[PDB]
Design a protein around this ligand. Structure first.
Ligand code: NA
Ligand code: NA
Ligand code: NA
Ligand code: NA
Ligand code: NI
Ligand code: NI
Ligand SMILES: [Zn+2]
Ligand SMILES: [Zn+2]
Lengths: 184, 184
Protein backbone atom coordinates (compact mmCIF):
# COMPACT_ATOMS: atom_id res chain seq x y z
CA UNK A 1 0.00 0.00 0.00
CA UNK A 2 0.90 3.64 -0.80
CA UNK A 3 -0.64 5.70 1.87
CA UNK A 4 0.09 8.92 -0.19
CA UNK A 5 -1.80 7.73 -3.25
CA UNK A 6 -5.09 9.15 -4.37
CA UNK A 7 -6.64 5.78 -3.61
CA UNK A 8 -5.74 6.00 0.10
CA UNK A 9 -6.84 9.63 0.56
CA UNK A 10 -9.62 8.80 3.02
CA UNK A 11 -7.36 6.63 5.14
CA UNK A 12 -4.53 9.16 5.09
CA UNK A 13 -6.67 12.19 5.85
CA UNK A 14 -8.48 10.26 8.64
CA UNK A 15 -5.17 9.46 10.37
CA UNK A 16 -3.77 12.94 9.90
CA UNK A 17 -6.99 14.67 11.07
CA UNK A 18 -7.23 12.52 14.20
CA UNK A 19 -3.55 13.13 14.96
CA UNK A 20 -3.97 16.90 14.65
CA UNK A 21 -7.21 17.37 16.49
CA UNK A 22 -7.54 14.63 19.12
CA UNK A 23 -6.27 15.68 22.57
CA UNK A 24 -3.84 13.31 24.26
CA UNK A 25 -0.09 13.19 23.84
CA UNK A 26 2.18 13.43 20.80
CA UNK A 27 5.82 12.37 20.57
CA UNK A 28 6.38 12.49 24.33
CA UNK A 29 4.53 15.75 25.05
CA UNK A 30 0.92 16.48 26.10
CA UNK A 31 -1.12 17.43 23.07
CA UNK A 32 -3.98 19.94 23.37
CA UNK A 33 -5.66 19.09 20.08
CA UNK A 34 -8.32 21.09 18.31
CA UNK A 35 -7.40 22.76 15.07
CA UNK A 36 -7.16 26.02 13.23
CA UNK A 37 -7.81 26.79 9.58
CA UNK A 38 -4.07 26.55 8.78
CA UNK A 39 -4.16 22.88 9.85
CA UNK A 40 -6.98 22.32 7.38
CA UNK A 41 -5.12 23.98 4.51
CA UNK A 42 -2.26 21.55 5.00
CA UNK A 43 -4.52 18.56 5.74
CA UNK A 44 -6.47 18.97 2.51
CA UNK A 45 -3.61 20.27 0.27
CA UNK A 46 -4.02 17.45 -2.28
CA UNK A 47 -7.43 18.95 -3.20
CA UNK A 48 -7.10 22.51 -4.48
CA UNK A 49 -10.90 22.83 -4.72
CA UNK A 50 -11.32 22.18 -0.98
CA UNK A 51 -8.50 24.56 -0.14
CA UNK A 52 -10.12 27.28 -2.27
CA UNK A 53 -13.35 26.93 -0.31
CA UNK A 54 -12.07 26.55 3.26
CA UNK A 55 -13.22 28.99 5.94
CA UNK A 56 -13.09 29.26 9.74
CA UNK A 57 -16.66 27.87 9.79
CA UNK A 58 -15.23 24.47 8.81
CA UNK A 59 -13.03 24.13 11.88
CA UNK A 60 -15.91 22.96 14.18
CA UNK A 61 -17.00 20.41 11.61
CA UNK A 62 -13.51 18.96 11.25
CA UNK A 63 -13.06 18.82 15.06
CA UNK A 64 -16.30 16.83 15.27
CA UNK A 65 -15.25 14.59 12.37
CA UNK A 66 -11.94 13.97 14.16
CA UNK A 67 -13.78 12.86 17.31
CA UNK A 68 -15.88 10.35 15.34
CA UNK A 69 -12.92 9.00 13.34
CA UNK A 70 -10.81 8.73 16.53
CA UNK A 71 -13.53 6.62 18.19
CA UNK A 72 -13.60 4.35 15.12
CA UNK A 73 -9.84 4.01 14.84
CA UNK A 74 -9.45 3.33 18.55
CA UNK A 75 -12.20 0.67 18.22
CA UNK A 76 -10.33 -0.92 15.31
CA UNK A 77 -7.06 -0.96 17.37
CA UNK A 78 -9.02 -2.97 19.99
CA UNK A 79 -10.62 -5.38 17.50
CA UNK A 80 -14.02 -3.82 18.20
CA UNK A 81 -15.00 -3.93 14.56
CA UNK A 82 -18.77 -3.90 15.07
CA UNK A 83 -18.51 -0.63 17.04
CA UNK A 84 -16.47 0.94 14.23
CA UNK A 85 -18.75 -0.44 11.52
CA UNK A 86 -21.93 0.90 13.14
CA UNK A 87 -20.44 4.38 13.33
CA UNK A 88 -18.98 4.34 9.81
CA UNK A 89 -22.25 3.03 8.31
CA UNK A 90 -24.13 5.86 9.89
CA UNK A 91 -21.71 8.44 8.45
CA UNK A 92 -22.06 6.90 4.98
CA UNK A 93 -25.87 7.12 5.28
CA UNK A 94 -25.87 10.66 6.74
CA UNK A 95 -23.50 12.21 4.19
CA UNK A 96 -23.31 12.09 0.36
CA UNK A 97 -21.35 8.95 -0.46
CA UNK A 98 -22.51 8.20 -4.02
CA UNK A 99 -19.35 7.77 -6.10
CA UNK A 100 -18.67 9.83 -9.21
CA UNK A 101 -16.01 9.71 -11.92
CA UNK A 102 -14.34 12.95 -12.96
CA UNK A 103 -11.26 14.01 -14.84
CA UNK A 104 -8.50 16.00 -13.02
CA UNK A 105 -7.22 19.08 -14.85
CA UNK A 106 -4.23 16.99 -16.02
CA UNK A 107 -6.63 14.53 -17.71
CA UNK A 108 -6.40 11.74 -15.11
CA UNK A 109 -9.74 10.03 -14.42
CA UNK A 110 -10.51 9.51 -10.72
CA UNK A 111 -13.29 7.80 -8.80
CA UNK A 112 -14.49 10.25 -6.13
CA UNK A 113 -16.26 8.73 -3.12
CA UNK A 114 -18.85 11.49 -3.06
CA UNK A 115 -20.82 13.50 -5.65
CA UNK A 116 -18.98 16.60 -6.91
CA UNK A 117 -21.84 18.77 -5.62
CA UNK A 118 -21.15 17.84 -1.98
CA UNK A 119 -20.66 20.40 0.78
CA UNK A 120 -17.17 20.47 2.24
CA UNK A 121 -17.45 18.83 5.69
CA UNK A 122 -20.00 16.27 4.41
CA UNK A 123 -17.69 15.47 1.52
CA UNK A 124 -14.66 14.84 3.75
CA UNK A 125 -16.82 12.86 6.17
CA UNK A 126 -17.83 10.52 3.33
CA UNK A 127 -14.30 10.25 1.98
CA UNK A 128 -12.84 9.46 5.38
CA UNK A 129 -15.60 7.03 6.32
CA UNK A 130 -15.32 5.08 3.07
CA UNK A 131 -11.51 4.97 3.43
CA UNK A 132 -11.70 3.43 6.88
CA UNK A 133 -14.56 1.13 5.85
CA UNK A 134 -12.55 -0.12 2.89
CA UNK A 135 -9.67 -1.18 5.09
CA UNK A 136 -12.06 -3.14 7.32
CA UNK A 137 -13.34 -4.88 4.17
CA UNK A 138 -9.78 -5.57 3.09
CA UNK A 139 -9.14 -7.42 6.36
CA UNK A 140 -6.60 -4.82 7.58
CA UNK A 141 -8.09 -4.06 11.02
CA UNK A 142 -5.00 -5.34 12.87
CA UNK A 143 -2.89 -2.67 11.14
CA UNK A 144 -4.58 0.18 13.05
CA UNK A 145 -2.39 0.98 16.05
CA UNK A 146 -1.86 3.41 18.92
CA UNK A 147 1.78 4.51 19.38
CA UNK A 148 3.74 2.45 21.90
CA UNK A 149 6.03 5.32 22.87
CA UNK A 150 5.81 6.99 26.26
CA UNK A 151 3.39 9.91 26.23
CA UNK A 152 2.30 9.33 22.68
CA UNK A 153 -1.21 8.19 21.80
CA UNK A 154 -1.16 9.15 18.18
CA UNK A 155 -2.70 6.67 15.76
CA UNK A 156 -1.12 4.96 12.79
CA UNK A 157 -1.86 2.48 10.04
CA UNK A 158 0.95 -0.07 9.67
CA UNK A 159 2.07 -0.18 6.04
CA UNK A 160 4.96 -2.66 6.67
CA UNK A 161 4.96 -6.09 4.95
CA UNK A 162 5.34 -7.88 8.29
CA UNK A 163 2.67 -5.90 10.19
CA UNK A 164 4.72 -5.47 13.33
CA UNK A 165 5.18 -1.65 13.45
CA UNK A 166 4.85 -0.33 17.03
CA UNK A 167 5.33 3.44 16.71
CA UNK A 168 3.42 6.20 14.97
CA UNK A 169 6.43 7.86 13.40
CA UNK A 170 10.10 7.90 12.76
CA UNK A 171 10.23 10.50 15.52
CA UNK A 172 8.94 8.06 18.13
CA UNK A 173 10.99 5.21 16.66
CA UNK A 174 14.12 7.42 17.09
CA UNK A 175 13.22 8.58 20.61
CA UNK A 176 12.89 4.96 21.73
CA UNK A 177 16.16 3.98 20.05
CA UNK A 178 17.94 6.96 21.69
CA UNK A 179 16.68 5.85 25.18
CA UNK A 180 17.64 2.16 24.78
CA UNK A 181 21.18 2.34 26.22
CA UNK A 182 20.37 4.45 29.30
CA UNK A 183 17.23 2.41 30.05
CA UNK A 184 19.11 -0.91 29.77
CA UNK B 1 -5.60 -8.72 -9.49
CA UNK B 2 -7.86 -11.65 -8.53
CA UNK B 3 -10.89 -11.37 -10.66
CA UNK B 4 -12.68 -14.04 -8.47
CA UNK B 5 -12.23 -12.11 -5.24
CA UNK B 6 -15.02 -10.41 -3.42
CA UNK B 7 -13.33 -7.10 -4.19
CA UNK B 8 -13.68 -7.61 -7.96
CA UNK B 9 -17.31 -8.81 -7.86
CA UNK B 10 -18.66 -5.86 -9.84
CA UNK B 11 -16.04 -6.20 -12.53
CA UNK B 12 -16.46 -9.96 -12.77
CA UNK B 13 -20.25 -9.95 -12.84
CA UNK B 14 -20.23 -7.10 -15.41
CA UNK B 15 -18.03 -9.13 -17.79
CA UNK B 16 -19.96 -12.34 -17.26
CA UNK B 17 -23.38 -10.65 -17.65
CA UNK B 18 -22.37 -8.90 -20.87
CA UNK B 19 -20.92 -12.15 -22.23
CA UNK B 20 -24.13 -14.05 -21.49
CA UNK B 21 -26.69 -11.55 -22.65
CA UNK B 22 -25.14 -9.42 -25.42
CA UNK B 23 -25.92 -10.74 -28.93
CA UNK B 24 -22.94 -11.14 -31.25
CA UNK B 25 -20.65 -14.13 -31.54
CA UNK B 26 -19.00 -16.37 -28.98
CA UNK B 27 -16.04 -18.70 -29.52
CA UNK B 28 -16.52 -18.87 -33.28
CA UNK B 29 -20.32 -19.23 -33.35
CA UNK B 30 -23.14 -16.65 -33.64
CA UNK B 31 -24.50 -15.86 -30.21
CA UNK B 32 -28.19 -15.00 -29.73
CA UNK B 33 -27.85 -13.47 -26.28
CA UNK B 34 -30.64 -12.67 -23.87
CA UNK B 35 -30.85 -14.69 -20.71
CA UNK B 36 -33.01 -16.97 -18.65
CA UNK B 37 -33.32 -17.25 -14.89
CA UNK B 38 -30.87 -20.19 -14.81
CA UNK B 39 -28.16 -17.86 -16.20
CA UNK B 40 -28.85 -15.50 -13.31
CA UNK B 41 -28.61 -18.24 -10.68
CA UNK B 42 -25.13 -19.07 -11.93
CA UNK B 43 -24.14 -15.43 -12.52
CA UNK B 44 -24.97 -14.40 -8.96
CA UNK B 45 -23.99 -17.68 -7.17
CA UNK B 46 -21.48 -15.94 -4.86
CA UNK B 47 -24.44 -14.16 -3.19
CA UNK B 48 -26.88 -16.63 -1.67
CA UNK B 49 -29.24 -13.79 -0.71
CA UNK B 50 -29.64 -12.72 -4.34
CA UNK B 51 -30.12 -16.31 -5.46
CA UNK B 52 -32.83 -16.80 -2.82
CA UNK B 53 -34.74 -13.81 -4.18
CA UNK B 54 -34.37 -14.28 -7.94
CA UNK B 55 -37.48 -14.54 -10.12
CA UNK B 56 -38.32 -14.44 -13.83
CA UNK B 57 -39.22 -10.75 -13.36
CA UNK B 58 -35.50 -9.99 -12.98
CA UNK B 59 -34.55 -11.27 -16.42
CA UNK B 60 -35.67 -8.05 -18.25
CA UNK B 61 -33.76 -5.92 -15.78
CA UNK B 62 -30.56 -7.91 -16.22
CA UNK B 63 -30.89 -7.83 -20.03
CA UNK B 64 -31.15 -4.04 -19.83
CA UNK B 65 -28.23 -3.83 -17.40
CA UNK B 66 -26.19 -5.97 -19.82
CA UNK B 67 -26.92 -3.54 -22.67
CA UNK B 68 -25.72 -0.56 -20.59
CA UNK B 69 -22.60 -2.34 -19.31
CA UNK B 70 -21.78 -3.58 -22.84
CA UNK B 71 -21.91 0.00 -24.16
CA UNK B 72 -19.57 1.11 -21.37
CA UNK B 73 -17.12 -1.75 -21.82
CA UNK B 74 -17.03 -1.31 -25.58
CA UNK B 75 -16.38 2.43 -25.00
CA UNK B 76 -13.52 1.58 -22.65
CA UNK B 77 -12.01 -0.83 -25.27
CA UNK B 78 -12.00 2.18 -27.67
CA UNK B 79 -10.50 4.64 -25.16
CA UNK B 80 -13.81 6.53 -25.08
CA UNK B 81 -13.60 7.04 -21.34
CA UNK B 82 -15.84 10.10 -21.15
CA UNK B 83 -18.70 8.15 -22.81
CA UNK B 84 -18.29 5.32 -20.29
CA UNK B 85 -17.96 7.71 -17.35
CA UNK B 86 -21.14 9.64 -18.22
CA UNK B 87 -23.13 6.42 -18.34
CA UNK B 88 -21.62 4.93 -15.18
CA UNK B 89 -22.14 8.18 -13.23
CA UNK B 90 -25.77 8.19 -14.16
CA UNK B 91 -26.21 4.59 -12.95
CA UNK B 92 -24.53 5.45 -9.64
CA UNK B 93 -26.91 8.41 -9.21
CA UNK B 94 -30.03 6.47 -10.30
CA UNK B 95 -29.46 3.42 -8.10
CA UNK B 96 -28.55 2.97 -4.40
CA UNK B 97 -24.77 3.16 -4.26
CA UNK B 98 -24.17 4.19 -0.63
CA UNK B 99 -21.66 1.71 0.77
CA UNK B 100 -22.35 -0.34 3.89
CA UNK B 101 -20.26 -2.67 6.04
CA UNK B 102 -21.72 -6.01 7.06
CA UNK B 103 -20.49 -9.29 8.43
CA UNK B 104 -20.86 -12.50 6.33
CA UNK B 105 -22.28 -15.51 8.18
CA UNK B 106 -18.69 -16.80 8.57
CA UNK B 107 -17.76 -13.59 10.43
CA UNK B 108 -15.87 -11.89 7.59
CA UNK B 109 -16.51 -8.13 7.36
CA UNK B 110 -17.21 -6.85 3.83
CA UNK B 111 -17.76 -3.43 2.30
CA UNK B 112 -20.90 -3.65 0.15
CA UNK B 113 -21.23 -1.06 -2.62
CA UNK B 114 -24.92 -0.59 -1.93
CA UNK B 115 -27.17 -0.43 1.15
CA UNK B 116 -28.40 -3.84 2.34
CA UNK B 117 -32.00 -2.70 1.81
CA UNK B 118 -31.53 -2.36 -1.97
CA UNK B 119 -33.82 -4.00 -4.51
CA UNK B 120 -32.17 -6.71 -6.58
CA UNK B 121 -31.65 -5.19 -10.05
CA UNK B 122 -30.79 -1.76 -8.58
CA UNK B 123 -28.32 -3.42 -6.26
CA UNK B 124 -26.50 -5.28 -9.06
CA UNK B 125 -26.58 -2.15 -11.21
CA UNK B 126 -24.75 -0.24 -8.47
CA UNK B 127 -22.28 -3.04 -7.82
CA UNK B 128 -21.45 -3.43 -11.49
CA UNK B 129 -21.23 0.30 -12.14
CA UNK B 130 -18.90 0.91 -9.19
CA UNK B 131 -16.73 -2.05 -10.25
CA UNK B 132 -16.23 -0.67 -13.74
CA UNK B 133 -15.81 2.88 -12.43
CA UNK B 134 -13.12 1.72 -10.02
CA UNK B 135 -11.05 0.23 -12.80
CA UNK B 136 -11.23 3.52 -14.73
CA UNK B 137 -9.98 5.27 -11.57
CA UNK B 138 -7.21 2.71 -11.24
CA UNK B 139 -5.96 3.59 -14.74
CA UNK B 140 -6.84 0.14 -16.15
CA UNK B 141 -8.94 1.22 -19.17
CA UNK B 142 -6.50 -0.34 -21.67
CA UNK B 143 -7.14 -3.77 -20.11
CA UNK B 144 -10.74 -3.90 -21.40
CA UNK B 145 -10.69 -5.85 -24.67
CA UNK B 146 -12.88 -7.43 -27.33
CA UNK B 147 -11.79 -10.95 -28.35
CA UNK B 148 -9.49 -11.09 -31.38
CA UNK B 149 -10.68 -14.52 -32.47
CA UNK B 150 -12.78 -15.01 -35.59
CA UNK B 151 -16.48 -14.77 -34.84
CA UNK B 152 -15.98 -13.89 -31.22
CA UNK B 153 -16.89 -10.49 -29.82
CA UNK B 154 -16.96 -11.43 -26.20
CA UNK B 155 -15.39 -8.97 -23.78
CA UNK B 156 -12.57 -9.51 -21.33
CA UNK B 157 -10.49 -7.72 -18.74
CA UNK B 158 -6.79 -8.52 -19.14
CA UNK B 159 -5.39 -9.70 -15.80
CA UNK B 160 -1.88 -10.51 -17.18
CA UNK B 161 1.19 -8.66 -15.82
CA UNK B 162 2.23 -7.60 -19.33
CA UNK B 163 -1.22 -6.44 -20.51
CA UNK B 164 -0.98 -8.04 -23.92
CA UNK B 165 -3.82 -10.64 -23.76
CA UNK B 166 -5.73 -10.81 -27.08
CA UNK B 167 -8.43 -13.44 -26.49
CA UNK B 168 -11.41 -13.69 -24.18
CA UNK B 169 -10.76 -17.23 -23.04
CA UNK B 170 -8.59 -20.26 -23.09
CA UNK B 171 -11.12 -21.63 -25.57
CA UNK B 172 -10.36 -18.91 -28.11
CA UNK B 173 -6.65 -19.03 -27.32
CA UNK B 174 -6.74 -22.81 -28.12
CA UNK B 175 -8.83 -22.42 -31.28
CA UNK B 176 -6.31 -19.93 -32.66
CA UNK B 177 -3.36 -22.15 -31.71
CA UNK B 178 -5.06 -25.17 -33.36
CA UNK B 179 -5.52 -23.18 -36.64
CA UNK B 180 -1.93 -21.82 -36.79
CA UNK B 181 -0.34 -24.63 -38.82
CA UNK B 182 -3.07 -24.93 -41.50
CA UNK B 183 -3.34 -21.13 -41.84
CA UNK B 184 0.44 -20.73 -42.23
NA1 NA C 1 -25.47 9.01 2.30
NA1 NA D 1 1.92 5.42 23.84
NA1 NA E 1 -27.65 6.70 -6.19
NA1 NA F 1 -13.27 -11.18 -32.65
NI1 NI G 1 -12.92 13.31 -4.04
NI1 NI H 1 -22.86 -6.52 -1.90
ZN1 LIG I 1 4.24 8.27 18.64
ZN1 LIG J 1 -13.28 -15.21 -27.73
Amino acid sequence: MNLDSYERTGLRVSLDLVNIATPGSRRGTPHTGGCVIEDLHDLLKDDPASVAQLGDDHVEGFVELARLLHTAIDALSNGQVATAATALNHLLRKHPATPELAQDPDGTWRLHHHPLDAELVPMWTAICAEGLAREIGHQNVRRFGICNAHRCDRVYFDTSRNGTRQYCSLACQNRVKAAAFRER
